Design a protein around this ligand. Structure first.
Ligand SMILES: [Mg+2]
Ligand SMILES: [Mg+2]
Ligand SMILES: [Mg+2]
Ligand SMILES: [Mg+2]
Ligand SMILES: [Mg+2]
Ligand SMILES: [Mg+2]
Ligand SMILES: [Mg+2]
Ligand SMILES: [Mg+2]
Ligand SMILES: [Mg+2]
Lengths: 25, 82, 181, 118, 70
RNA sequence: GGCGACACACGUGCUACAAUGCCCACUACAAAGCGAUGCCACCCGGCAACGGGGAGCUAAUCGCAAAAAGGUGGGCCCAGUUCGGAUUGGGGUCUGCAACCCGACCCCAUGAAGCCGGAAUCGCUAGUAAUCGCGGAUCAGCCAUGCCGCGGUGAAUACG
RNA sequence: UCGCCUCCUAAAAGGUAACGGAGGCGCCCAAAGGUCCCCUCAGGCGGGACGGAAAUCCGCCGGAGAGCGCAAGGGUAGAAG
């Protein structure tokens, strides 16, 4: 889901981080 | 979207506040949407510039985060052949 | 004579309240809710009887009384159908059964309606009668949802011995008719 | 189980079954069953009636959902009825609200193509 | 009359918030989620929210920053 | 104010229609480059964007970065569905004098079209095509899915 | 055009002509037939989900303007419907 802003995969693709992709640990 | 600023034009407010003591006349222009709806002087008209002319917009509560020029469309469109 | 809570609620509460509100001098001048008749406009069964029968037993379950088919009076090529053709069900119920239905109507079904802000107060006849539309029929406690095929509704007519549509406005208000102010 | 305005989802995980309500989505889903204290991976098939009651009582209250909040959302757009702003006119003309590109695309609000030709 | 209609048994039915009687109908007892004569939704009124107004909050949210004040 | 207009038409693309797939958690393995009018370790508030602190670094020393596809475990079970993410409501953050016209993110809720594409049409012969992430220029910010580079895994076929 | 049916011409009995004014027929129905028992229409105004000028439903008002297989006339709800 490279364009969904609610996945670790979409957050990768977008670049930014957040709740669905924390800044590690 | 500001939070700790939440600004209005100083010059818009200067003209708006010194013409707010005990009443006024609706003759008041501007040149900047940049501002914000401003509570008080609700029963007022602010002639906003749309790039071409000054459109008299009217305030009647209801409006807030919408500054001015949203009440002043700059384009016309109107139709596409139809 | 059975019993029925709404029936009692009419006599030992709603009844004397009317004699106070309106000051009727006779025991019969008081508005008496009688005859509630359910009708289903069934164009859906324009050309189907197994869709009409399913609507029959469905209705028989919520009123405890078999409905009767109505037939088209004339013929309208503008929207099919000829003289015959079972187009519409209808069951009349007065006494006992009318109350048992009216209870589950007000005290189960009506609140089970999506959103629902209350019955229309302008939906009054002018001769002391009331009518109300219904969409889904699954709002009745005897309907089990997972046994339906189509969401067909019904019109409901509640007849009353009142004169004006005020004395009825009052009579039903007391019985528990939510009127959206 | 007729939770809010709906009942549909049977044998399909309560954290997922919840999603099938306008107002729940995915975040409020697990948030509701951790706050109600119910196992998310359950059958949804009418399990313990008590869990279902607590769930219903919490969910249906708390926040607005289903037909009620659809009405509120539609009313928030009705806000820009009156003598409203620019954003209202975009809801009027049927065009994209967020000032995007309308020269091409914008089909999700404009609808399928009409083709003028000339 | 005889030999067609369903019969009408005594009273018992379960509400999602409490109790209900009457029943009759055909089934002995049935379940009802959204209760009625009890209390929720237009039965004593339980104002779930209030739908915020901009004259109040947004004049005190944008106005929370009273830097533009006076 | 406009270059951002929108009844429409074409090009180059990005994201998909799913199960050799999606989600969550854990755990590995790169290169090439950029930074002390900046990169910002580690703590603290915060669901998060981010804010408070604050160490090291004129940088094969410190930081940007954990590479991602992979592997392990678990969950969905083929249905517009935990596929897909458009559109829209609400709430926020950051740069900026200021983001209505027109900024990027974050969070809640919506969840559209699409179930693999007519006539046509394109690329590639070995590290190649396909797929996966990383860096830089411009740059306050950014509409970058673009362009210029970096490496990861790694086909098929060529009679003629 | 040529037989049959209806209305007018037709001069308040019947009858009455013209290459006068207008229309129908050459069938249909085993129920649209017999009888017994029930029932009352069209419209107008309100009320009512989908449902509109007309679909079914409730309510008043409505002596017959409906209906009576098909032309027209006569008749007809105290029925022929
Ligand atoms: Mg635009
Ligand atoms: Mg340009
Ligand atoms: Mg589709
Ligand atoms: Mg499929
Ligand atoms: Mg070659
Ligand atoms: Mg004569
Ligand atoms: Mg005569
Ligand atoms: Mg004579
Ligand atoms: Mg007979």
């Amino acid at each position: 889901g490279k364009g969904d802003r609610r996945t670790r995969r979409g957050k990768i693709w977008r670049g930014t981080y957040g709740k669905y992709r924390p800044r590690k640990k | 979207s500001l939070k700790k600023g939440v600004f209005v034009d100083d010059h818009l407010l200067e003209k708006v506040l010194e013409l707010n003591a005990k009443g006024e006349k609706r003759l008041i222009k501007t040149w900047s949407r940049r501002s914000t709806i401003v509570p008080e002087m609700v029963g007022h008209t602010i002639a906003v510039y749309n790039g071409k002319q000054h459109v008299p917009v009217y305030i009647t509560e209801n409006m807030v985060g919408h500054k001015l020029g949203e009440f002043a469309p700059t384009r016309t469109y109107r139709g596409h052949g139809k | 004579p059975l019993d029925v809570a709404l029936k009692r609620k009419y006599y030992e509460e709603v009844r004397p309240e009317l004699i106070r509100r309106f000051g009727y001098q006779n025991v019969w001048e008081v508005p008496r809710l009688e005859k509630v008749v359910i009708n289903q406009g069934l164009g859906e069964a324009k050309e189907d009887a197994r869709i009409l029968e399913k609507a029959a037993q469905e209705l028989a379950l919520i009123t405890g009384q078999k409905p009767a088919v109505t037939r088209a009076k004339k013929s309208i090529s503008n929207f099919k159908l000829r003289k015959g053709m079972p187009i519409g069900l209808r069951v009349t119920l007065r006494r006992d059964r009318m109350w048992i239905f009216l209870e589950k109507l007000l005290n189960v079904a009506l609140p089970r309606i999506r959103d629902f802000r209350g019955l229309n107060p302008n939906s009054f006849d002018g001769r002391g009668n009331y009518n109300l539309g219904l969409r889904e029929q699954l709002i009745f406690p005897e309907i089990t949802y997972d046994m339906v095929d189509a969401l067909r509704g019904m019109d409901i007519a509640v007849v009353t011995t009142a004169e004006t549509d005020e004395e009825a406005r009052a009579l039903l208000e007391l019985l528990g008719f939510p009127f959206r102010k | 189980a007729r939770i809010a305005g709906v009942e549909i989802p049977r044998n399909k995980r309560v954290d997922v079954a919840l999603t099938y309500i306008y107002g729940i989505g995915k975040a409020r889903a697990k948030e509701a069953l951790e706050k109600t204290g119910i196992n998310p991976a359950t059958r949804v098939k009418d399990l313990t009636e008590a869990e279902v009651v607590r769930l219903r009582e919490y969910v249906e209250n708390t926040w607005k959902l289903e037909g009620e909040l659809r009405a509120e959302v539609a009313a928030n757009i009705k806000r820009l009825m009156d003598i409203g702003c620019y954003r209202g006119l975009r809801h009027r003309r049927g065009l994209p609200v967020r000032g995007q590109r309308t020269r091409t695309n914008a089909r999700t609000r404009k609808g399928p193509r009409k083709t003028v030709a000339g | 009359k005889e030999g067609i209609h369903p019969k009408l048994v005594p009273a018992r039915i379960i509400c999602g918030c409490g109790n209900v009687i009457e029943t009759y109908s055909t089934k002995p007892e049935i379940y009802v989620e959204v209760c009625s004569k009890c209390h929720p939704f237009y039965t004593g009124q339980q104002r779930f929210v209030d739908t915020e107004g901009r004259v109040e909050r947004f004049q005190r949210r944008y106005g929370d920053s009273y830097r533009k004040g006076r």
